Amino acid sequence: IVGGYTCGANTVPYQVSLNSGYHFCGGSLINSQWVVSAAHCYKSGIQVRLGEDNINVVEGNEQFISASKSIVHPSYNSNTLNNDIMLIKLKSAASLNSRVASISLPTSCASAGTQCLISGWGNTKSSGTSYPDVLKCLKAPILSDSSCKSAYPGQITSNMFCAGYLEGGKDSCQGDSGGPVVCSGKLQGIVSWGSGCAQKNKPGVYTKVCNYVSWIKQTIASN
Numbered sequence: 001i002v003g004g005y006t007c008g009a010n011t012v013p014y015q016v017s018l019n020s021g022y023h024f025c026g027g028s029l030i031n032s033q034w035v036v037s038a039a040h041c042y043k044s045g046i047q048v049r050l051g052e053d054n055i056n057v058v059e060g061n062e063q064f065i066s067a068s069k070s071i072v073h074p075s076y077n078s079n080t081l082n083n084d085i086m087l088i089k090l091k092s093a094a095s096l097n098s099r100v101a102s103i104s105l106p107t108s109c110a111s112a113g114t115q116c117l118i119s120g121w122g123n124t125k126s127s128g129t130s131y132p133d134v135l136k137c138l139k140a141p142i143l144s145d146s147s148c149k150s151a152y153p154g155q156i157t158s159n160m161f162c163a164g165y166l167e168g169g170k171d172s173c174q175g176d177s178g179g180p181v182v183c184s185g186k187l188q189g190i191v192s193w194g195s196g197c198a199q200k201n202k203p204g205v206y207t208k209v210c211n212y213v214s215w216i217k218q219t220i221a222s223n
């Protein structure tokens, strides 16, 4: 997160770190056995780390659980990042608590104007590179579909929304990928992509989770 704040230990109990020897992506716990992330975060031998603040220190609220199964969306296009969503089953259920907790799925899509919390261990600088150990937060509004398409011509499908500030300065960034965009207690977004970080007229692009609920529910019901 660029130009955000330190969330605070466990203040976002649904944030997970995807770990393959190292944090490489964010994720969101949606029940005791499943995480939602970005498809472009797919790789094998993932361990899900829940209850994390400092990802480089064991501080006492962690649960480390290996992924048993990953499922990229059937229609994921790695080239356009269309349908950038993925579900990961945990090898055992997480012990759900105040600091480790699922975030609800949307019943409807959110609108332009809605305030949302984006979070992740990604790079904190818009130029140059600095990775935080503790989780970083950003409050950002969903931007209109027309301004999103205008910022990114020929790239914004119906499965993406922009969130952030057109002035720049505040955005998600490298390492936030697959992480939560939570709006009014509901997971509305997954950190998908952007042109750099916090650049003017170049806000973050998010997977529109409301388009995927049916698939998420149907999938978790049979796996």
Ligand SMILES: Cc1ncc(CO)c(CO)c1O
Pocket: 171, 172, 173, 174, 175, 176, 177, 178, 191, 192, 193, 194, 195, 196, 197, 204, 205
């Ligand atoms: C803005 C932005 N830029 C680049 C990346 C690379 O994944 C991400 C997520 O990893 C991101 O959110």
Ligand SMILES: [Ca+2]
Pocket: 052, 053, 054, 055, 056, 057, 058, 059, 060, 062
């Ligand atoms: Ca830790």
Ligand SMILES: [Cl-]
Pocket: 144, 145, 146, 147
């Ligand atoms: Cl519009």
Ligand SMILES: [Cl-]
Pocket: 149, 153, 154, 155
């Ligand atoms: Cl267009």
